[PDB]
RNA sequence: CCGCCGGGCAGCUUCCGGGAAACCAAAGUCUUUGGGUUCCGGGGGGAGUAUGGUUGCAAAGCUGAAACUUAAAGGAAUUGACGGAAGGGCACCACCAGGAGUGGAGCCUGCGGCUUAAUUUGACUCAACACGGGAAACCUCACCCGGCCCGGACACGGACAGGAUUGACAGAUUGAUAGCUCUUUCUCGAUUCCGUGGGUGGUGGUGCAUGGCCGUUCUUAGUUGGUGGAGCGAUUUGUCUGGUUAAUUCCGAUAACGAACGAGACUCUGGCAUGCUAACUAGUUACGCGACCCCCGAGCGGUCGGCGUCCCCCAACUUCUUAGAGGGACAAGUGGCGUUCAGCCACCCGAGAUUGAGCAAUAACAGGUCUGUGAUGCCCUUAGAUGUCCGGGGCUGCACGCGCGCUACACUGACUGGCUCAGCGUGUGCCUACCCUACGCCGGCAGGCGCGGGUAACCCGUUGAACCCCAUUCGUGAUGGGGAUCGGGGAUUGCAAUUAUUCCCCAUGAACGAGGAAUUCCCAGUAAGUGCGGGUCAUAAGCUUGCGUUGAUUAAGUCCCUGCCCUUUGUACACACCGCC
């Protein structure tokens, strides 16, 4: 309900967010190949350097 | 209203729609509010299916008098051929591919290749 | 609702006074300007800044309108 | 018994033909108008009245006006819709069988009222009442007692200079260091000011001027068309006697046949998956156990039981964790029952055909919403402004009334030791100034003061909880339950808490010993208790929405009340019985 009234019904607004992650060992080619390809839809990609 | 929304509804069907509807709620040549609804073809009105099949769209319209609502609600016939139409089947709908061949009882025989 | 009676004391919207202001400028014989009265301490109001006698007030008006004291 | 014949009482049936229609061998032969003849009606009432005449023993009978008023009254059939009609069917917003309560007390806050300057206000059965996310000091906030401020767009007019008054540091004041105003004047300097029209807002007005969004009739089974077939035609069948079904869902009888929306299918979810793909942002698992390792403990010692760690890892793995692909469960088998169809019931293997929501048609309704909307019609109002605010105040006020909550009434319990089991979340560093918190001291405690991790599956955090569970008091005393109302301190948030902010520490220490008339809630991991998150948050919840946790009794059917679906029927109702009269 906008405003007050009517028998009290609510909605149950949901958004999921699954995280995958993949470890690897490479140079600055294989990272910059594999990351820039396979992009496109609503997908965020992080790239950690090493360990921390 | 009349001639216009037909002009729309005509079009959207002729374009290539499974079905469609238009609603023009609001005051309409009278101090009282009417609600008009001109409909054509097929339309599913429940389920998840609705979510990725109908193309709902509300728009107001602010006129020299007051305010009407448009509601266009088109049904997409990408069920036939999206290219791979998402799911394609409305889950109700099953397509049984037909016997095709299944010829010959006959006497036995053999062959070699 | 109510309809506003108003205690009969219709408060004054006031003019900031008319005033030509700059006639009182002592030109003693040839061209030279300086009178004396009370002064303000501000920077944009540099030394020339000038004061008064009212029913009390006195004010200084020269960091454009920024800075009137309390006398 | 079987025929025929006349004239009698009657029946069915039909596209004669009639018939407004219902119907009618006759109401048939009627614009294709008249076989004979009798009576008799000309909108409704007034009125079968008045008056006159007559008959009668009289009730009364017979004959029988008008003024006036009146727009329909009426008839036949249609859908409605309601029956204190009838069959069928169904809902725990229904009942049964109960428990839990609720309705009683105190307290909370919701409204009503009174009171009050003000207690702004929307919301009025149900589908208004901890609802407007409505837990409000200040803001909120609109509202009152004031009081400031202008943020008067825009244009159109008016104002070159003896500078249009842009903008003014000490006092009179004022609340204010509001030049907002009463002299003084010292600068920006083409702004300014004053008209006119016109805006611009307004948590002003109107939700019967509207958009959207919502609520609901109503998670109830319903709704619709193409072609047929019926009706001159509105309409009607298809759309249904019965069995079935959560469900016009199905099969079948079947002037219908095959279709469409709703239901169903779907999505999310919830549970079987030593089956797969894997995972230092899970777990890890158990190792291998290589250890530290202290007798942590067993044991003379070998050896072992075990938390912790020393880990790391170039173990190994997914046994639980996680989340991807999968599978499966599908009335699937067998035995009843069943028109032996549609299915129903029981049992087998096993999750037995139903784990729980979201989505939800046609069509509605002055439901609610203009105060969620820079959605807004028109209206008001428009500078002294209902434009925006500062300060305060109110929204909290109190002889009464109701509404949702909590806590109790105690000993299956009360307070006194102790042991010890999560889940869904949540978190900083965020759109304008702001968290989550681990571990040190200090203090009783609120807390305080130290310091640490944390875009988080890492840090909080083996989330170390309450009931619960276990260890002692107490003895049925309004008692140690209960725990209101006040006395006094101390912290914290906040610029500020007076109008106890919130918290702590003291201190007082109430009614209630199971609730009068009523009435909602629901069947399985269900009611109840029980904390805990989230939402609300500077401060903060007795609010909701989720989450486990502990976990019952009982129905497993019926329509007995209330209310819903179809069918048949009646209906002077169609503002639909809360009607009409
Ligand atoms: Mg006749
Ligand atoms: Mg005739
Ligand atoms: Mg007449």
mmCIF file with all atom_site columns, C-alpha atoms (C1' of nucleotides) in Angstrom, chain B residues 25-27 31-33 37 42-43 45-49 60 62 65-69 71 91-92, chain D residues 209-213 260-267 358-363 366 375-378:
data_model
loop_
_atom_site.group_PDB
_atom_site.id
_atom_site.type_symbol
_atom_site.label_atom_id
_atom_site.label_alt_id
_atom_site.label_comp_id
_atom_site.label_asym_id
_atom_site.label_entity_id
_atom_site.label_seq_id
_atom_site.pdbx_PDB_ins_code
_atom_site.Cartn_x
_atom_site.Cartn_y
_atom_site.Cartn_z
_atom_site.occupancy
_atom_site.B_iso_or_equiv
_atom_site.pdbx_formal_charge
_atom_site.auth_seq_id
_atom_site.auth_comp_id
_atom_site.auth_asym_id
_atom_site.auth_atom_id
_atom_site.pdbx_PDB_model_num
ATOM 1  C CA    . UNK B 1 25  ? -8.335  4.755   -17.813 1.00 0.00 ? 25  UNK B CA    1
ATOM 2  C CA    . UNK B 1 26  ? -9.277  8.300   -16.774 1.00 0.00 ? 26  UNK B CA    1
ATOM 3  C CA    . UNK B 1 27  ? -11.871 11.020  -17.414 1.00 0.00 ? 27  UNK B CA    1
ATOM 4  C CA    . UNK B 1 31  ? -16.866 14.905  -15.347 1.00 0.00 ? 31  UNK B CA    1
ATOM 5  C CA    . UNK B 1 32  ? -16.794 11.206  -14.332 1.00 0.00 ? 32  UNK B CA    1
ATOM 6  C CA    . UNK B 1 33  ? -13.893 8.742   -14.857 1.00 0.00 ? 33  UNK B CA    1
ATOM 7  C CA    . UNK B 1 37  ? -10.089 -1.629  -22.617 1.00 0.00 ? 37  UNK B CA    1
ATOM 8  C CA    . UNK B 1 42  ? -3.878  -14.147 -26.821 1.00 0.00 ? 42  UNK B CA    1
ATOM 9  C CA    . UNK B 1 43  ? -2.651  -13.080 -23.342 1.00 0.00 ? 43  UNK B CA    1
ATOM 10 C CA    . UNK B 1 45  ? -2.490  -13.349 -16.988 1.00 0.00 ? 45  UNK B CA    1
ATOM 11 C CA    . UNK B 1 46  ? -0.607  -15.286 -14.246 1.00 0.00 ? 46  UNK B CA    1
ATOM 12 C CA    . UNK B 1 47  ? 2.514   -17.362 -13.494 1.00 0.00 ? 47  UNK B CA    1
ATOM 13 C CA    . UNK B 1 48  ? 6.224   -16.738 -13.680 1.00 0.00 ? 48  UNK B CA    1
ATOM 14 C CA    . UNK B 1 49  ? 5.682   -17.054 -17.495 1.00 0.00 ? 49  UNK B CA    1
ATOM 15 C CA    . UNK B 1 60  ? 0.447   8.652   -18.087 1.00 0.00 ? 60  UNK B CA    1
ATOM 16 C CA    . UNK B 1 62  ? -1.185  15.026  -19.245 1.00 0.00 ? 62  UNK B CA    1
ATOM 17 C CA    . UNK B 1 65  ? -8.137  18.771  -19.261 1.00 0.00 ? 65  UNK B CA    1
ATOM 18 C CA    . UNK B 1 66  ? -6.528  16.258  -16.832 1.00 0.00 ? 66  UNK B CA    1
ATOM 19 C CA    . UNK B 1 67  ? -4.754  12.886  -16.732 1.00 0.00 ? 67  UNK B CA    1
ATOM 20 C CA    . UNK B 1 68  ? -5.374  9.546   -18.460 1.00 0.00 ? 68  UNK B CA    1
ATOM 21 C CA    . UNK B 1 69  ? -3.428  6.361   -18.075 1.00 0.00 ? 69  UNK B CA    1
ATOM 22 C CA    . UNK B 1 71  ? -1.388  0.724   -20.224 1.00 0.00 ? 71  UNK B CA    1
ATOM 23 C CA    . UNK B 1 91  ? 5.052   -24.535 -19.987 1.00 0.00 ? 91  UNK B CA    1
ATOM 24 C CA    . UNK B 1 92  ? 1.433   -25.700 -20.682 1.00 0.00 ? 92  UNK B CA    1
ATOM 25 C "C1'" . A   D 2 209 ? -12.315 16.410  -10.834 1.00 0.00 ? 209 A   D "C1'" 1
ATOM 26 C "C1'" . U   D 2 210 ? -8.420  12.351  -12.158 1.00 0.00 ? 210 U   D "C1'" 1
ATOM 27 C "C1'" . G   D 2 211 ? -3.214  8.971   -13.350 1.00 0.00 ? 211 G   D "C1'" 1
ATOM 28 C "C1'" . G   D 2 212 ? -0.505  5.259   -10.979 1.00 0.00 ? 212 G   D "C1'" 1
ATOM 29 C "C1'" . C   D 2 213 ? -0.386  2.431   -6.970  1.00 0.00 ? 213 C   D "C1'" 1
ATOM 30 C "C1'" . A   D 2 260 ? -9.276  -19.147 -25.265 1.00 0.00 ? 260 A   D "C1'" 1
ATOM 31 C "C1'" . C   D 2 261 ? -8.372  -16.504 -20.054 1.00 0.00 ? 261 C   D "C1'" 1
ATOM 32 C "C1'" . G   D 2 262 ? -8.685  -18.021 -14.781 1.00 0.00 ? 262 G   D "C1'" 1
ATOM 33 C "C1'" . A   D 2 263 ? -7.550  -22.832 -11.859 1.00 0.00 ? 263 A   D "C1'" 1
ATOM 34 C "C1'" . G   D 2 264 ? -3.849  -26.170 -13.172 1.00 0.00 ? 264 G   D "C1'" 1
ATOM 35 C "C1'" . A   D 2 265 ? 1.295   -26.233 -15.635 1.00 0.00 ? 265 A   D "C1'" 1
ATOM 36 C "C1'" . C   D 2 266 ? 5.300   -22.082 -13.762 1.00 0.00 ? 266 C   D "C1'" 1
ATOM 37 C "C1'" . U   D 2 267 ? 8.726   -19.527 -10.252 1.00 0.00 ? 267 U   D "C1'" 1
ATOM 38 C "C1'" . G   D 2 358 ? 4.394   -15.514 -5.418  1.00 0.00 ? 358 G   D "C1'" 1
ATOM 39 C "C1'" . C   D 2 359 ? 2.193   -15.045 -9.570  1.00 0.00 ? 359 C   D "C1'" 1
ATOM 40 C "C1'" . A   D 2 360 ? -3.537  -14.616 -9.665  1.00 0.00 ? 360 A   D "C1'" 1
ATOM 41 C "C1'" . A   D 2 361 ? -9.082  -13.752 -14.891 1.00 0.00 ? 361 A   D "C1'" 1
ATOM 42 C "C1'" . U   D 2 362 ? -13.568 -11.420 -16.432 1.00 0.00 ? 362 U   D "C1'" 1
ATOM 43 C "C1'" . A   D 2 363 ? -15.562 -7.844  -13.858 1.00 0.00 ? 363 A   D "C1'" 1
ATOM 44 C "C1'" . A   D 2 366 ? -17.306 7.760   -4.849  1.00 0.00 ? 366 A   D "C1'" 1
ATOM 45 C "C1'" . A   D 2 375 ? 1.367   12.257  -11.483 1.00 0.00 ? 375 A   D "C1'" 1
ATOM 46 C "C1'" . U   D 2 376 ? -2.064  16.083  -11.120 1.00 0.00 ? 376 U   D "C1'" 1
ATOM 47 C "C1'" . G   D 2 377 ? -7.748  18.385  -12.795 1.00 0.00 ? 377 G   D "C1'" 1
ATOM 48 C "C1'" . C   D 2 378 ? -9.867  22.278  -11.409 1.00 0.00 ? 378 C   D "C1'" 1
#
